[PDB]
Coordinates of C-alpha atoms (C1' of nucleotides) in Angstrom, one line a residue:
Chain H
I201 CA 309.4 143.6 154.6
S202 CA 312.5 144.9 156.5
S203 CA 312.3 148.5 157.7
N204 CA 314.6 149.7 154.9
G205 CA 312.5 147.9 152.4
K206 CA 315.5 146.1 150.9
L207 CA 314.7 142.6 152.3
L208 CA 311.6 140.5 152.4
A209 CA 311.1 137.3 154.2
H210 CA 308.3 134.9 153.6
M211 CA 307.0 131.4 154.3
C212 CA 306.1 128.5 152.0
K213 CA 304.4 125.1 151.9
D214 CA 306.4 123.4 149.2
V215 CA 308.6 121.8 151.9
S216 CA 305.4 120.6 153.5
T217 CA 304.8 118.8 150.1
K218 CA 308.4 117.6 150.0
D219 CA 309.2 116.9 153.7
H220 CA 307.7 116.2 157.1
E221 CA 309.4 119.4 158.2
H222 CA 306.6 121.6 156.9
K223 CA 307.0 125.3 156.4
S224 CA 310.0 126.9 154.8
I225 CA 311.3 130.3 155.7
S226 CA 313.0 132.2 152.8
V227 CA 314.5 135.6 152.9
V228 CA 315.4 137.4 149.6
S229 CA 317.0 140.7 148.8
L230 CA 315.2 143.1 146.6
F231 CA 317.3 145.8 144.7
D232 CA 320.4 143.5 144.6
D233 CA 320.8 139.8 144.8
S234 CA 323.2 139.7 147.8
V235 CA 321.2 137.6 150.2
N236 CA 318.9 134.7 149.6
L237 CA 318.3 131.9 152.3
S238 CA 315.8 129.1 152.7
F239 CA 315.5 126.7 155.5
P240 CA 312.7 124.6 157.1
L241 CA 310.8 125.4 160.2
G242 CA 311.6 122.0 161.4
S243 CA 315.2 123.1 161.7
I244 CA 314.1 126.4 163.2
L245 CA 311.8 125.2 166.0
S246 CA 312.8 123.3 169.1
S247 CA 312.6 119.5 169.2
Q248 CA 310.7 119.3 172.6
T249 CA 307.7 121.0 171.0
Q250 CA 306.7 118.2 168.8
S251 CA 304.8 116.5 171.6
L252 CA 302.8 119.7 172.1
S253 CA 300.2 121.7 170.3
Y254 CA 299.6 123.5 167.1
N255 CA 299.3 126.7 169.2
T256 CA 302.9 126.4 169.8
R257 CA 303.8 125.3 166.2
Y258 CA 301.7 128.2 164.7
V259 CA 304.0 131.1 163.6
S260 CA 302.1 134.4 163.8
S261 CA 304.5 137.2 163.0
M262 CA 307.8 137.8 161.3
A263 CA 310.4 140.6 161.6
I264 CA 313.8 141.0 159.9
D265 CA 316.7 143.1 160.8
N266 CA 317.9 145.7 158.3
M267 CA 321.2 143.9 157.8
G268 CA 319.6 140.4 157.6
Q269 CA 321.5 139.0 160.7
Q270 CA 318.4 138.5 162.9
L271 CA 315.1 137.1 162.1
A272 CA 312.4 137.1 164.9
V273 CA 309.4 134.7 164.6
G274 CA 306.6 135.0 167.0
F275 CA 304.3 132.0 167.6
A276 CA 300.7 131.8 168.5
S277 CA 301.5 130.4 171.9
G278 CA 303.3 133.7 172.7
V279 CA 307.0 132.8 172.7
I280 CA 309.3 134.8 170.4
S281 CA 312.3 133.1 168.9
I282 CA 315.1 135.2 167.3
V283 CA 317.3 133.2 164.9
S284 CA 320.7 134.5 164.1
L285 CA 321.1 133.8 160.2
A286 CA 324.9 133.1 160.4
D287 CA 324.8 129.8 162.3
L288 CA 321.0 129.6 161.9
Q289 CA 320.4 129.3 165.6
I290 CA 317.7 130.4 168.1
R291 CA 317.3 132.4 171.3
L292 CA 314.1 132.4 173.2
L293 CA 312.1 135.4 174.5
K294 CA 309.2 134.4 176.7
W295 CA 306.8 137.0 178.0
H296 CA 303.4 137.0 176.2
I297 CA 300.8 134.6 177.5
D298 CA 298.6 134.9 174.3
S299 CA 299.5 135.3 170.7
Chain W
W411 CA 261.7 101.0 200.6
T412 CA 259.6 102.2 203.6
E413 CA 262.3 103.5 206.0
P414 CA 264.7 106.2 204.9
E415 CA 267.6 104.4 206.4
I416 CA 266.7 101.1 204.8
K417 CA 266.2 103.2 201.6
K418 CA 269.9 104.3 202.0
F419 CA 270.8 100.6 202.4
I420 CA 268.8 99.4 199.3
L421 CA 270.1 102.4 197.4
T422 CA 273.7 101.4 198.1
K423 CA 272.9 98.0 196.9
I424 CA 271.2 99.4 193.7
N425 CA 274.4 101.3 193.0
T426 CA 276.4 98.1 193.8
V427 CA 274.3 96.5 190.9
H429 CA 268.8 99.2 187.6
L430 CA 269.7 102.7 188.9
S431 CA 269.1 104.2 185.5
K432 CA 265.6 102.6 184.9
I433 CA 264.5 103.4 188.5
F434 CA 265.6 107.0 188.0
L435 CA 263.7 107.1 184.7
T436 CA 260.4 105.8 186.2
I437 CA 260.9 108.1 189.2
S438 CA 261.4 111.0 186.7
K439 CA 258.3 110.2 184.8
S440 CA 256.1 109.7 187.8
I441 CA 257.3 113.0 189.3
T442 CA 256.9 115.0 186.1
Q443 CA 253.4 113.6 185.9
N444 CA 252.6 114.5 189.5
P445 CA 254.7 117.2 190.9
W446 CA 252.5 118.0 193.9
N447 CA 252.4 114.4 195.2
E448 CA 251.8 114.4 198.9
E449 CA 253.7 111.1 199.3
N450 CA 257.1 112.4 200.2
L451 CA 258.8 108.9 200.0
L452 CA 259.4 109.0 196.3
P453 CA 261.0 112.5 196.5
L454 CA 263.2 111.0 199.3
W455 CA 264.2 108.4 196.7
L456 CA 265.2 111.0 194.2
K457 CA 266.9 113.2 196.8
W458 CA 269.0 110.5 198.2
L459 CA 269.8 109.1 194.8
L460 CA 271.0 112.6 193.7
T461 CA 273.0 113.3 196.8
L462 CA 274.8 110.0 196.4
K463 CA 275.2 109.2 192.7
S464 CA 275.4 112.3 190.6
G465 CA 278.4 111.5 188.5
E466 CA 277.2 108.3 187.0
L467 CA 273.8 110.0 186.3
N468 CA 275.9 112.5 184.3
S469 CA 278.1 109.9 182.5
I470 CA 275.6 107.2 181.6
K471 CA 273.6 108.4 178.6
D472 CA 273.0 111.6 176.5
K473 CA 269.3 111.6 175.3
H474 CA 266.8 109.4 177.1
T475 CA 267.8 110.7 180.4
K476 CA 268.5 114.3 179.5
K477 CA 265.1 115.0 177.9
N478 CA 263.1 113.9 180.9
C479 CA 265.7 115.7 183.0
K480 CA 265.0 118.9 181.2
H481 CA 261.2 118.4 181.6
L482 CA 261.3 117.7 185.3
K483 CA 263.7 120.8 185.6
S484 CA 261.0 122.8 184.0
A485 CA 258.3 121.5 186.4
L486 CA 260.3 121.9 189.5
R487 CA 261.5 125.4 188.4
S488 CA 257.9 126.3 188.0
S489 CA 257.5 125.2 191.6
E490 CA 260.4 127.5 192.6
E491 CA 258.5 130.3 190.9
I492 CA 255.2 129.5 192.7
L493 CA 256.7 129.6 196.2
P494 CA 256.9 133.3 197.3
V495 CA 253.4 134.4 196.7
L496 CA 252.3 131.2 198.7
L497 CA 254.5 132.4 201.6
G498 CA 252.9 135.9 201.4
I499 CA 249.5 134.3 201.4
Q500 CA 250.4 132.4 204.5
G501 CA 251.5 135.6 206.1
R502 CA 248.2 137.2 205.3
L503 CA 246.3 134.2 206.8
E504 CA 248.4 134.5 209.9
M505 CA 247.5 138.1 210.2
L506 CA 243.7 137.3 209.9
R507 CA 244.1 134.6 212.5
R508 CA 245.6 137.0 214.9
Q509 CA 242.8 139.5 214.2
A510 CA 240.2 136.9 214.9
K511 CA 242.1 136.1 218.2
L512 CA 241.9 139.8 219.0
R513 CA 238.2 139.8 218.3
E514 CA 237.7 136.8 220.7
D515 CA 239.7 137.9 223.8
Chain U
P520 CA 230.7 130.1 161.9
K521 CA 234.1 130.1 160.0
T522 CA 233.8 133.9 159.6
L523 CA 233.2 134.4 163.3
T524 CA 236.1 132.2 164.2
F525 CA 238.2 134.2 161.7
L526 CA 237.2 137.4 163.4
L527 CA 238.0 135.9 166.8
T528 CA 241.5 135.2 165.2
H529 CA 241.5 138.8 164.0
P530 CA 243.2 141.3 166.3
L531 CA 240.8 144.2 166.3
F532 CA 237.2 143.5 167.6
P533 CA 235.6 146.9 167.8
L534 CA 233.6 147.7 170.9
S535 CA 230.0 146.4 171.3
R536 CA 230.5 142.7 170.6
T537 CA 233.3 142.7 173.1
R538 CA 231.0 144.5 175.5
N539 CA 228.1 141.9 175.3
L540 CA 228.8 138.7 173.4
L541 CA 229.8 136.6 176.5
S542 CA 226.1 136.3 177.3
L543 CA 225.4 135.0 173.8
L544 CA 228.3 132.5 174.1
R545 CA 227.2 131.4 177.6
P548 CA 231.9 125.0 174.0
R549 CA 234.3 125.3 171.1
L550 CA 233.4 128.9 170.3
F551 CA 233.5 129.6 174.1
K552 CA 237.1 128.2 174.3
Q553 CA 238.1 130.2 171.2
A554 CA 236.7 133.4 172.4
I555 CA 238.3 133.0 175.9
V556 CA 241.8 132.2 174.4
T557 CA 241.4 135.2 172.1
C558 CA 239.3 138.2 172.4
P559 CA 241.1 141.6 172.5
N560 CA 238.6 143.3 175.0
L561 CA 237.0 141.4 177.8
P562 CA 235.0 143.1 180.7
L563 CA 236.0 142.2 184.3
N564 CA 232.4 141.9 185.7
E565 CA 231.3 139.4 183.0
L566 CA 234.7 137.5 183.2
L567 CA 234.7 137.2 186.9
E568 CA 231.1 136.0 186.9
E569 CA 232.1 133.4 184.3
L570 CA 235.0 132.4 186.5
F571 CA 232.8 132.2 189.6
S572 CA 230.4 130.0 187.7
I573 CA 231.0 126.4 188.7
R574 CA 231.3 125.1 185.0
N575 CA 234.9 124.1 185.7
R576 CA 236.3 122.9 182.3
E577 CA 239.8 124.0 183.5
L578 CA 238.3 127.4 182.6
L579 CA 239.6 128.2 186.1
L580 CA 243.1 128.1 184.6
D581 CA 242.1 129.7 181.3
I582 CA 240.1 132.7 182.5
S583 CA 242.6 133.2 185.4
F584 CA 245.6 133.3 183.0
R585 CA 243.6 135.6 180.8
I586 CA 242.6 138.2 183.4
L587 CA 246.1 138.0 185.0
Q588 CA 247.7 138.6 181.6
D589 CA 245.5 141.5 180.6
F590 CA 244.5 143.4 183.9
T591 CA 245.7 145.0 187.1
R592 CA 245.6 143.9 190.7
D593 CA 243.8 147.0 192.0
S594 CA 241.2 146.6 189.2
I595 CA 240.6 142.9 190.0
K596 CA 240.5 143.8 193.8
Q597 CA 237.8 146.5 193.2
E598 CA 235.7 144.3 190.9
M599 CA 235.8 141.3 193.4
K600 CA 234.9 143.8 196.2
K601 CA 231.8 144.7 194.1
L602 CA 231.1 140.9 193.7
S603 CA 229.3 138.6 196.1
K604 CA 230.6 137.0 199.2
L605 CA 228.8 133.6 198.9
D606 CA 230.3 132.6 195.7
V607 CA 233.7 133.7 197.0
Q608 CA 233.1 131.3 199.9
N609 CA 232.1 128.5 197.5
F610 CA 235.1 129.2 195.3
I611 CA 237.6 129.1 198.2
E612 CA 236.0 125.9 199.3
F613 CA 236.5 124.5 195.7
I614 CA 240.2 125.5 196.0
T615 CA 240.8 123.9 199.3
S616 CA 239.0 120.8 198.2
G617 CA 240.6 120.5 194.8
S631 CA 248.6 126.6 189.8
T632 CA 250.2 130.0 190.3
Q633 CA 247.3 131.6 188.5
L634 CA 244.8 130.3 191.0
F635 CA 247.2 131.2 193.8
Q636 CA 247.4 134.7 192.6
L637 CA 243.6 134.6 192.4
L638 CA 243.5 133.5 196.0
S639 CA 245.8 136.4 196.9
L640 CA 243.6 138.9 195.1
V641 CA 240.3 137.5 196.7
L642 CA 242.1 137.9 200.0
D643 CA 242.9 141.4 199.1
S644 CA 239.3 142.1 198.0
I645 CA 237.8 140.6 201.1
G646 CA 240.0 142.4 203.5
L647 CA 239.7 142.0 207.3
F648 CA 235.9 141.4 207.8
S649 CA 234.3 138.4 206.4
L650 CA 236.4 135.3 207.6
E651 CA 234.7 132.3 208.9
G652 CA 236.5 130.1 211.6
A653 CA 236.9 126.6 210.4
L654 CA 237.1 127.7 206.7
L655 CA 240.2 129.7 207.7
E656 CA 241.5 126.7 209.7
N657 CA 241.3 124.5 206.6
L658 CA 242.8 127.2 204.5
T659 CA 245.8 127.6 206.8
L660 CA 246.2 123.8 207.0
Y661 CA 246.2 123.5 203.2
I662 CA 248.4 126.5 202.6
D663 CA 250.9 125.3 205.3
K664 CA 251.2 121.8 203.7
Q665 CA 251.5 123.2 200.3
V666 CA 254.2 125.6 201.4
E667 CA 255.9 122.6 202.8
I668 CA 255.7 120.5 199.7
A669 CA 256.8 123.5 197.6
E670 CA 259.8 124.0 199.9
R671 CA 260.8 120.4 199.4
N672 CA 260.2 120.8 195.7
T673 CA 262.6 123.8 195.5
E674 CA 265.3 122.0 197.5
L675 CA 265.0 119.0 195.1
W676 CA 265.2 121.3 192.1
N677 CA 268.4 122.9 193.3
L678 CA 269.8 119.4 194.0
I679 CA 268.9 118.7 190.3
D680 CA 270.8 121.8 189.2
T681 CA 273.8 120.7 191.4
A702 CA 296.9 107.8 198.5
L703 CA 298.4 106.6 201.8
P704 CA 299.6 103.0 201.4
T705 CA 301.4 102.6 204.7
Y706 CA 301.4 98.8 204.5
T707 CA 299.0 97.0 202.1
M708 CA 299.6 93.3 201.8
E709 CA 298.5 92.5 198.2
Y710 CA 299.1 89.8 195.6
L711 CA 299.4 89.8 191.8
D712 CA 298.7 87.3 189.1
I713 CA 302.0 86.6 187.1
Chain C
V502 CA 255.8 145.2 214.2
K503 CA 253.7 142.1 214.0
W504 CA 251.4 143.1 216.8
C505 CA 251.4 146.7 215.6
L506 CA 250.1 145.7 212.2
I507 CA 247.7 143.4 213.9
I508 CA 246.1 146.0 216.1
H509 CA 246.3 149.4 214.5
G510 CA 245.4 148.4 210.9
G511 CA 242.4 150.7 210.6
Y512 CA 244.3 153.9 210.6
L513 CA 246.8 152.3 208.3
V514 CA 244.2 151.4 205.7
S515 CA 242.7 154.8 206.2
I516 CA 245.9 156.8 205.4
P517 CA 246.4 157.2 201.6
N518 CA 250.1 157.1 200.8
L519 CA 251.1 154.1 202.9
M520 CA 254.4 153.6 200.9
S521 CA 255.6 157.1 201.7
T522 CA 254.6 156.7 205.3
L523 CA 256.2 153.2 205.9
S524 CA 259.0 153.6 203.4
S525 CA 261.8 152.1 205.4
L526 CA 259.9 149.1 206.5
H527 CA 258.9 148.3 202.9
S528 CA 262.5 148.6 201.8
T529 CA 264.0 146.5 204.5
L530 CA 261.6 143.7 204.1
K531 CA 262.2 144.0 200.3
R532 CA 265.9 143.3 200.8
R533 CA 265.4 140.3 203.0
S534 CA 262.8 138.8 200.9
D535 CA 264.9 139.2 197.9
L536 CA 267.8 137.6 199.6
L537 CA 266.0 134.3 200.3
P538 CA 266.3 132.3 197.1
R539 CA 270.2 132.2 197.0
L540 CA 270.1 131.2 200.7
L541 CA 267.8 128.3 199.7
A542 CA 270.3 127.2 196.9
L543 CA 273.3 127.4 199.2
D544 CA 271.5 125.4 202.0
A545 CA 270.5 122.8 199.4
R546 CA 274.2 122.2 198.2
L547 CA 275.5 122.5 201.8
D548 CA 273.0 119.8 202.9
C549 CA 274.0 117.6 200.0
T550 CA 277.7 117.7 200.9
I551 CA 277.0 117.3 204.7
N552 CA 274.9 114.2 204.2
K553 CA 277.6 113.0 201.8
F554 CA 280.2 113.1 204.3
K555 CA 278.0 111.9 207.1
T556 CA 276.7 108.7 205.4
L557 CA 280.1 107.2 205.5
Chain T
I599 CA 255.4 155.4 190.3
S600 CA 253.0 153.3 188.3
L601 CA 253.7 149.7 188.9
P602 CA 251.3 147.0 187.7
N603 CA 252.0 143.3 188.1
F604 CA 251.6 141.8 184.7
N605 CA 252.2 138.0 184.2
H606 CA 253.1 138.7 180.5
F607 CA 256.5 140.0 179.4
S608 CA 256.7 141.9 176.1
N609 CA 260.1 143.0 174.9
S610 CA 258.8 145.9 172.9
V611 CA 257.5 149.0 174.6
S612 CA 257.5 152.7 173.8
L613 CA 256.1 155.9 175.2
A614 CA 255.7 159.6 174.3
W615 CA 255.0 162.8 176.2
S616 CA 252.9 165.9 175.2
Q617 CA 254.6 169.3 175.3
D618 CA 252.4 170.6 178.1
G619 CA 253.6 167.8 180.4
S620 CA 250.1 166.3 181.0
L621 CA 249.3 163.5 178.6
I622 CA 251.6 160.5 178.4
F623 CA 251.1 157.8 175.8
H624 CA 252.4 154.5 177.1
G625 CA 252.4 152.0 174.2
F626 CA 252.8 148.5 175.5
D627 CA 252.3 145.6 173.1
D628 CA 249.0 145.6 171.3
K629 CA 247.8 148.5 173.5
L630 CA 248.4 152.2 173.9
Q631 CA 247.2 153.7 177.2
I632 CA 246.8 157.5 177.7
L633 CA 247.6 158.7 181.2
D634 CA 247.5 162.0 183.0
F635 CA 250.9 162.9 184.7
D636 CA 249.1 164.1 187.9
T637 CA 247.5 160.7 188.6
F638 CA 249.4 158.2 186.6
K639 CA 246.0 156.6 185.8
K640 CA 243.7 156.4 182.9
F641 CA 242.4 159.8 181.6
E642 CA 238.7 159.0 181.8
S643 CA 236.6 161.6 179.9
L644 CA 233.6 163.1 181.7
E645 CA 232.1 163.9 178.3
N646 CA 233.0 160.5 176.8
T647 CA 233.3 161.7 173.1
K648 CA 234.8 158.3 172.0
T649 CA 238.2 159.6 172.9
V650 CA 238.9 156.2 174.5
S651 CA 241.9 156.0 176.9
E652 CA 243.1 152.8 175.3
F653 CA 243.9 152.1 171.7
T654 CA 244.3 148.6 170.4
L655 CA 246.5 148.3 167.3
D656 CA 246.7 145.2 165.0
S657 CA 250.5 144.7 165.3
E658 CA 253.0 145.0 168.0
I659 CA 254.0 148.6 168.6
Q660 CA 257.6 149.5 167.7
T661 CA 257.3 153.2 167.8
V662 CA 254.9 155.9 169.2
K663 CA 255.5 159.6 168.5
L664 CA 253.5 162.8 168.5
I665 CA 254.7 165.3 165.8
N666 CA 252.7 168.1 167.5
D667 CA 250.0 168.1 170.2
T668 CA 247.6 166.8 167.5
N669 CA 249.0 163.9 165.4
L670 CA 250.2 160.6 166.9
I671 CA 252.3 158.4 164.7
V672 CA 252.6 154.6 165.5
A673 CA 254.9 152.2 163.8
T674 CA 253.5 148.8 164.4
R675 CA 255.2 145.4 163.8
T676 CA 253.7 145.2 160.3
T677 CA 252.4 148.6 159.5
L678 CA 252.3 152.3 160.2
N679 CA 249.2 154.3 161.4
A680 CA 248.8 158.0 161.8
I681 CA 246.0 159.1 164.1
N682 CA 244.6 162.5 165.1
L683 CA 243.9 163.2 168.8
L684 CA 241.4 166.2 168.2
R685 CA 239.2 163.4 166.7
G686 CA 239.8 159.8 167.9
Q687 CA 240.1 158.2 164.4
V688 CA 243.1 157.0 162.4
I689 CA 243.9 159.3 159.6
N690 CA 246.5 157.4 157.5
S691 CA 247.8 153.9 157.0
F692 CA 250.9 152.4 155.4
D693 CA 251.9 148.8 154.8
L694 CA 255.5 147.8 155.8
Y695 CA 255.2 144.1 156.2
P696 CA 257.2 143.1 153.1
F697 CA 259.7 145.8 153.9
Chain Z
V463 CA 281.2 128.9 199.6
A464 CA 279.5 127.4 196.6
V465 CA 282.8 127.0 194.9
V466 CA 284.6 125.9 198.1
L467 CA 282.1 123.0 198.5
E468 CA 282.5 122.4 194.8
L469 CA 286.3 122.0 195.3
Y470 CA 287.2 120.4 198.5
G471 CA 284.6 117.6 199.3
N472 CA 287.3 115.0 199.8
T473 CA 289.4 116.8 202.3
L474 CA 286.1 117.8 203.9
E475 CA 285.6 114.2 204.6
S476 CA 289.2 113.6 205.5
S477 CA 289.7 116.4 208.2
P478 CA 287.2 116.8 211.0
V479 CA 287.6 120.5 211.8
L480 CA 285.9 121.7 208.5
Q481 CA 283.1 119.2 209.3
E482 CA 282.3 121.2 212.5
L483 CA 282.6 124.4 210.6
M484 CA 280.1 123.0 208.0
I485 CA 277.8 122.2 211.0
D486 CA 277.9 125.8 212.2
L487 CA 277.4 127.0 208.6
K488 CA 274.4 124.8 208.1
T489 CA 272.8 126.0 211.3
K490 CA 273.3 129.7 210.5
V491 CA 272.1 129.4 206.9
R492 CA 269.0 127.6 208.2
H493 CA 268.5 130.5 210.7
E494 CA 268.8 133.0 207.9
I495 CA 266.3 131.2 205.7
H496 CA 263.9 131.4 208.7
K497 CA 264.6 135.2 209.1
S498 CA 263.8 135.8 205.4
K499 CA 260.7 133.6 205.5
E500 CA 259.3 135.8 208.4
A501 CA 260.2 138.9 206.4
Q502 CA 258.4 137.8 203.3
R503 CA 255.4 137.0 205.5
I504 CA 255.4 140.5 206.9
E505 CA 255.7 142.0 203.5
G506 CA 252.6 140.0 202.4
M507 CA 250.9 141.4 205.5
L508 CA 251.6 144.9 204.2
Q509 CA 250.4 144.1 200.7
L510 CA 247.2 143.0 202.3
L511 CA 246.9 146.2 204.4
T512 CA 247.4 148.5 201.4
Chain J
rA1 C1' 277.3 127.2 170.1
rU2 C1' 271.1 128.0 165.7
rG3 C1' 265.9 129.8 165.5
rC4 C1' 261.8 131.7 168.5
rG5 C1' 261.4 133.8 173.1
rA6 C1' 260.9 137.6 178.6
rA7 C1' 265.7 138.5 182.6
rA8 C1' 262.4 131.9 182.1
rG9 C1' 262.4 128.7 178.7
rC10 C1' 260.6 126.0 174.0
rA11 C1' 262.0 123.3 169.6
rG12 C1' 266.9 121.4 167.0
rU13 C1' 272.1 120.4 166.3
rU14 C1' 278.0 116.8 166.5
rG15 C1' 277.9 114.8 158.2
rA16 C1' 281.1 113.3 154.8
rA17 C1' 285.5 113.7 151.4
rG18 C1' 290.8 114.6 151.0
rA19 C1' 295.6 115.0 153.1
rC20 C1' 299.4 114.2 156.7
rA21 C1' 301.8 112.2 161.3
rA22 C1' 302.5 108.3 164.7
rG23 C1' 301.7 103.2 166.1
rU24 C1' 300.8 98.4 163.9
rG25 C1' 298.1 96.5 154.7
rC26 C1' 295.0 98.2 159.7
rU27 C1' 294.0 101.9 164.7
rU28 C1' 294.2 107.0 166.6
rG29 C1' 295.2 112.2 166.1
rU30 C1' 295.9 116.4 163.2
rC31 C1' 294.4 120.4 159.2
rG32 C1' 297.7 127.9 157.0
rU33 C1' 292.0 121.7 153.1
rU34 C1' 287.2 121.2 150.6
rC35 C1' 281.9 120.6 150.2
rG36 C1' 276.4 120.1 153.3
rU37 C1' 273.5 121.7 157.4
rU38 C1' 269.2 126.8 161.1
rA39 C1' 275.4 125.0 164.0
rA40 C1' 295.6 124.2 178.8
rA41 C1' 300.8 124.4 177.8
rA42 C1' 306.5 125.9 175.4
rU43 C1' 308.4 128.8 184.2
rG44 C1' 305.4 132.7 180.4
rG45 C1' 301.3 138.6 183.4
rC46 C1' 301.0 145.3 182.9
rC47 C1' 306.9 151.1 183.1
rU48 C1' 309.0 155.6 185.1

RNA sequence: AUGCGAAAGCAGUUGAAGACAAGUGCUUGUCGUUCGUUAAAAUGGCCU
């Protein structure tokens, strides 16, 4: 839940059922119906990580901006990725060596 | 099999070609008699271990490792037995010197 | 009797049978009483050890007394004991294990500095020296158990 | 110290508290005798490697 | 010091001390020894009124206590035994082996 | 030195300087074993002389 | 790696089902899946 409490963002497995791209990120507004987005983690992640481990492909924490522009995912390998939700694109923040 | 150098030679030939079964019979013989005065068979095991440890690790899983754990138990008991034997040797040396002092 | 073997299995055995039942027991009940009896006097036990019965009761009684008693007490009782059987016992050891080696240590402690024969001590030093040597080789063996530039290489392949 | 313990042992067995008298001797021999087994292990592995590179 | 060399190791020991500073009850497995603090040796009675320096208890000792200078409580591996010291005999018993 | 011998046996064979260093190390460790053997003997002598 | 045990050790353990991916109906690997047993990766390191 975003720090205002106006947005939530969760993950799903129905795109694992309906795709090879497995987990779906969906962000939904709460007190109005202004924002609602859904996209696969296959599109979120990099492509050079598919020859690598589930430690890298295991998302471990989510955080949302209070405007909905930025969504930060944190993997179990210790590399944060911040997606801008306009063009749905990533920037990498690499410091942690554990999860 | 008599000379240690020819033992090195025939050991290199055994590892060229048998090593598992001779290790097994050496293991059973030594875990039967740990205090065997014939050092030649311990020289066999010592040279085989200082040459060919990796294949001894990688050959099998049960019918080497069980006897390996048993021989480990026996020889660790020998490592336990050593120090009081050294102390008894020291006391006997003291008594020998006292006897010498009584003589001269 | 089955009741007596059950009482030998039983932990508490009060005072007087533990004091003097070893003379009464002096096979199967002997082995049972020596592997289990809660109180066992040192004089009778050392006399039973220094008897030459030798049913590996060397190992049994030695493990028993080294389990239950103290080095100073064993030293004092074997000081009270006789010298001739001590000589016959150490002759038995040098003719033919940590239990009996600690026994040898304690009989050395009880005998002290006075009663040492010559050739007996020579054979004892020879036996102890060769056994220290074989124990050292044994220890080293146990620790051993616990243990690019192709400048021009003319080869040929099979196509 | 070997010859001393050889010769003068009568007064040594006569004095009661031999530990409190010969304290530092007992402690020094204690350190060294406790040091021994790791040295045996290190020499075993060192001799293994030395004979390994010497055999060829 | 009091350092005997026992070839048997038992994981369960206990001990207790009288209020005067003289009597020490060292309860090793199966056996309680009564010692004088001045000697660290067995308190051998010159009268010998069956106040024996060693007690042998049926189970392994988990606890020794003295509630006063009179009553010694022992909690043994199956049971519990309350003994008096002004007369060397067990007063009370309690079974704890199912518990 | 246990972990150094565990690691570098191949370059130990390849380079000759470390071979001479292992010779000196072998001699000194054997000498130290001799020292501690004599010390254990003298401690046994004391335990007799108690 | 479980139980007993002392800081030793002594016994025993690695079974299936389902699903998916890749490669070629078949092989391996995987599990944010079930039941049965006593059972190394994303060049990324600690303030003033």
